[PDB]
Design a protein around this ligand. Structure first.
Ligand SMILES: NC(=O)c1ncn([C@@H]2O[C@H](COP(=O)(O)O)[C@@H](O)[C@H]2O)n1
Ligand SMILES: NC(=O)c1ncn([C@@H]2O[C@H](COP(=O)(O)O)[C@@H](O)[C@H]2O)n1
Ligand SMILES: NC(=O)c1ncn([C@@H]2O[C@H](COP(=O)(O)O)[C@@H](O)[C@H]2O)n1
Ligand SMILES: NC(=O)c1ncn([C@@H]2O[C@H](COP(=O)(O)O)[C@@H](O)[C@H]2O)n1
Ligand SMILES: [K+]
Ligand SMILES: [K+]
Ligand SMILES: [K+]
Ligand SMILES: [K+]
Ligand code: NA
Ligand code: NA
Ligand code: NA
Ligand code: NA
Lengths: 357, 357, 357, 357
């Protein structure tokens, strides 16, 4: 077997060390634009998010309401594919024809929307999603290091060339990244085991600390870019617990972030808002739960947070403020200048409130 | 004294990183056969289990019912030797003559069964077990790095040559492995302190993290094979808490796994099924407890799990699925291709369900 | 991004190993004097504290009463600047004209006092503080690695030359130290995230273990001194939980220590003494709490400790005793001779009371 | 300041890995004799304990009854010196004249006994203890790296030559050992902060993990022996929680072990046996508690264990059994052959009972 020199680490084990903050860096001047799909050296991506957040490919997260609400703020949603082809295409169509500052739209001013696909019924599902107006697709899987994803991407390329964009994943190391890169993926998703509703141990025991996974994949992605001139955006998927984890993921090299729990708490998520003992909650279940995969996972509740807009603004304002502490006005600048330290196992306590009531 | 460069680690500190999964790897095509006794380069073992699981040499685990139930699924039980010679031989005889898909049997279609022996009354116990029809024997001890085991194996070789198979142990490092290998053991058992009912600290303070023990012994076993052309199967004994620990043990190099608690929960274990406050439990005590060694250990209860068959199928289906994630269709292929990472002390939390009710 | 070879550590992870204690080292012979502002090689600081403790620039800590009480014992307070310019100058004036063994005073025998300033209204606030009689100033910020601090110090130098002393901060590494050193700071404050009422994670995720921060900054400060002949005193700000942490901070190289919670517990702090369920407490809130910054932080209570005098004497007696264990009669000697070890993550338990009721 | 490459570790972080156990190693053949005072290469110590245990220099542990009970089993007690010179000499006299298999006695068949002394009144206390018949003395201090101990030992040598034996300590590193070795100590005590009733953090913050301290001192002691031909026995004082910690301390190089809590639980300790809510306890307080030092520490209770004899036999039987697992028939052989591993921070759980009720 193959072993590694260091153990893997998660986002909670890292902190950012400030860099020189100049007079021109104030939160309002920070640009959070980021590429969504691959491009060549010297070019710009054909699709750029206005904010680095995308909603998870989950029944309890990315419905039509979510897709519209997020696109309005500059991000994009990936309508879940764990439903009939007709039902998914209907949601995509509804988002693209909803209009019949930071909004993410196409040349026709329609909100952009993505859709998840599987390695099984893609020959029928992909055409339907394309006709419905899907702007980008993404193969939804816990282990993207599979010949099945290569086959799926291959079929798409042979039928649509590079006109149809498709992300692939998930992978957690350089080898997995390279395999999907060579396969033709437009963006690669990183993360196995980090999800809030994913209990690795009680399952297959496959995974890797999210921080280590991102750092490793990003190194391989940068090596790949230098070798081929092709820049492939990567997505840190899962493991975001606190707002600063967003800043860390981006600083470590991720172009954008995929979140489930974070968005499930909003009014726009497709789940039911239920009031339990005085506390308004929202349902949240993983795609691996029996409650979903049958149309491996856990079913739960998340505290109601209200409308997406206000929460995203608050989260990103903190990200922007932190970026200025690090001397960065853009994500690429943050990825270049960030100083990231690991924190001791025997600590973390000093970081939070201590010795006070 | 002699010290080591790194601290020892247990199974809970590791995770598997996926490899390339090909279209031909589906759980149903995975072969879990594995060698039980030593053989020379170019040969196959005289005894191959159909599944890599064997039941512990314990009064509360391996009785005749267990031996039949496990052999039926492809594994083998080691009838406890902590009973009279006549009583143990009777159980072996009963299993071998019970018949008077994955079943593990001899050339006469009779279920295979093993039996534990001690370094004290072997001159009388071994002959009885052989006559009763025992297919394999195993010296039962917490510290197999003993001249007593060499003497026992020597007596068996001098009286039966290589016709009677005998495992030895337990050891936790290369030196212990080599000593028993040179002594003539047919397979060597690994593990001291990892058992669920073994409290190292409150005892002698001897032991080693199970993962480190397996990894070290396997390295020595492979070195031994290259030097002598002799391949000696090794058994990871104890420390299995979750199904994925099985996959890890095998990936680290163990040919098969010995479990106590896992099997004690089944209907076929020889202990009493007792109902406590609405919960059906099964008794489970270690061989070191006063309740047993007198015909150092703890006496306890384990949740009733039902029939062995359904539980083993579920566990192994998960192992097979994980093997496919790692690109392995067989155990030897898994041992060659597995990518195994240690996880941070400051983590493991991200791995399970978090920040959700 | 830039990474580090080792994770950061906090004070609780360290212990001091005794050195040779001579017959002349008794607590009463220990000198705790220390420089407050920069000077050149061969010179002495223009301001030397008689004890290495200064009170935090906080509304709930450094009022006029605190400043007088601390100066009387040899330390200095930094009157909070989170109030009107007129109100702050009034407190400074009151301390300087209060008289109208270890007392810290000027050439006119008046108690010394400091005052915090911000990078916004300094053109008006600084002149007022100078006229009021402020002996030293200090820019109050969580991230001192800013062009704003360079501008502020520059304005002060251009208007007052080196006659007005001004500390800057906070920083946590060599780069931040060097930036403020070159900018002209008279002393540099170290620490981000360590404060008792600062919850890093629930904020920006910026910071560094206090011990590592001090050690790193001190190394850079010593390198700077060797290069330029300029010695810049540094202050360890925040993270002090136990008295021995004071000894550690000083041993690691800090010239003095800034504390908030420690002083808030005293009768002289400007907060209200409230009795809760039989326990007398004192209010304590961070400068980042809404309760303060509006004239990011937490509001709380700290156990009443009584008068400052008796508590400081007790704390420093322990520091002096420990210094003698280390063979040091002065702080510089402690910084040169201290033997400091990190303690295992798997321990710390042996250090406290254990296995006894 | 001086730093170290590795953090310090405690006994709970280590486990012993078995070595070859021969047929001649059974508990009853294990010899636990060990030297108490220094000797030259090729010689034997003038005083050899029959068991490697000595009772702490504490009011709540080593009284006349304890000294007699322990000497009867082969160990020695150090009558506390935190009492009047007359009172301490009386206890020593009573033990030496009490008679007016493994018993530790002098040439006159009288039980051996030790006595603690301080660096203050030794000019009067030492003569009294010598006349009373003390067999060995030991300077009692938390930080033995002091000129005061050198002076004390010097006075003893000048007045009695090498006829009066005197141990010194405590120290935790090679430098401290060497200082006391050159000063003339007959044996050196190791340990600061490990005591069960010693709360390092709430005090001076001085100390070192006991395991690391012993290992380091032993290395220096062996280097010293090779340089001068003088072998100085060392004592591991404090930190023993479990019986196996005894085996570890000895395996790491300590010639004998000093314990407080362990002995306080016995009928022979001088404290009161009190019954609390159905549980018989014994009082136990440190020498640093106000309750003692006035004729820094904690006052507590320890579960009654009964007579010393039966408990010591049980503890040492386990030590002997473990020694045989390691292939050692004597302490020196154990120190030469022991294989000692550190255990992961993320573990230790596997070592104890787990996943069972
Ligand atoms: N285990 C499951 O049932 C399940 N369902 C979704 N997921 C993963 O978790 C991610 C969401 O993580 P989180 O809630 O944001 O921490 C998804 O984008 C996906 O990669 N896991
Ligand atoms: N300490 C005891 O009393 C005792 N009895 C059995 N054992 C060990 O524990 C193993 C079972 O571990 P577990 O229950 O499967 O974790 C046995 O195969 C044996 O090696 N230990
Ligand atoms: N986060 C806040 O609201 C806040 N207010 C003050 N502080 C920091 O905490 C320090 C006090 O730390 P402590 O209470 O002594 O641990 C201050 O000197 C300052 O650097 N932080
Ligand atoms: N801190 C105290 O008040 C005190 N009193 C005794 N001690 C130390 O603790 C040792 C006993 O440790 P323990 O109880 O056996 O863990 C003593 O031999 C001594 O070195 N410490
Ligand atoms: K900055
Ligand atoms: K795979
Ligand atoms: K000392
Ligand atoms: K052995
Ligand atoms: Na904090
Ligand atoms: Na998880
Ligand atoms: Na302690
Ligand atoms: Na165990």
């Amino acid at each position: 077997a193959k072993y590694y020199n260091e153990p893997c680490h998660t986002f909670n084990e890292y902190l950012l060390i400030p860099g020189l903050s100049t007079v021109d860096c104030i939160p309002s001047n920070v640009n959070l634009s980021t590429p969504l799909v691959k491009f060549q050296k010297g070019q710009q991506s054909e699709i750029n998010l206005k904010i680095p957040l995308v909603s998870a490919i989950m029944q309890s997260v990315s419905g039509e309401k979510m897709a519209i609400a997020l696109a309005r703020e500059g991000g994009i949603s990936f309508i879940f594919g764990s439903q009939s082809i007709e039902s998914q295409a209907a949601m995509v169509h509804a988002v693209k024809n909803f209009k019949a500052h930071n909004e993410l739209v196409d040349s026709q001013k329609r909100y952009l929307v993505g859709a998840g696909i599987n390695t099984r019924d893609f020959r029928e599902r992909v055409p339907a999603l394309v006709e419905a107006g899907a702007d980008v697709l993404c193969i939804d899987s816990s282990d993207g290091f599979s010949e099945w994803q290569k086959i799926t991407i291959g079929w798409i390329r042979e039928k649509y060339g590079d006109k149809v964009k498709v992300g692939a994943g998930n992978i957690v190391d350089g080898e997995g990244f390279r395999y999907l890169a060579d396969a033709g993926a437009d963006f690669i998703k990183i993360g196995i085991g980090g999800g809030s509703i994913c209990i690795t141990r009680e399952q297959k025991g496959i995974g890797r600390g999210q921080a280590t996974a991102v750092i490793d994949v990003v190194a391989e992605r940068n090596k790949y870019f230098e070798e081929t001139g092709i820049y492939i955006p990567v997505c840190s998927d899962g493991g975001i617990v606190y707002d600063y984890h967003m800043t860390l993921a981006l600083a470590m090299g991720a172009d954008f972030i995929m979140l489930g729990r974070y968005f499930a708490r909003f009014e726009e998520s497709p789940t039911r808002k239920v009031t339990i003992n005085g506390s308004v909650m929202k349902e949240y279940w993983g795609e691996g739960s029996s409650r979903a995969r049958n149309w491996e996972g856990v079913d739960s509740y998340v505290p109601y947070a209200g409308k997406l807009k206000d929460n995203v603004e608050a989260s990103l304002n903190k990200v922007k403020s932190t970026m200025c502490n690090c001397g960065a006005l853009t994500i690429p600048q943050l990825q270049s200048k960030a100083k990231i330290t690991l924190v001791s196992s025997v600590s973390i306590v000093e970081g939070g409130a201590h010795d006070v009531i």
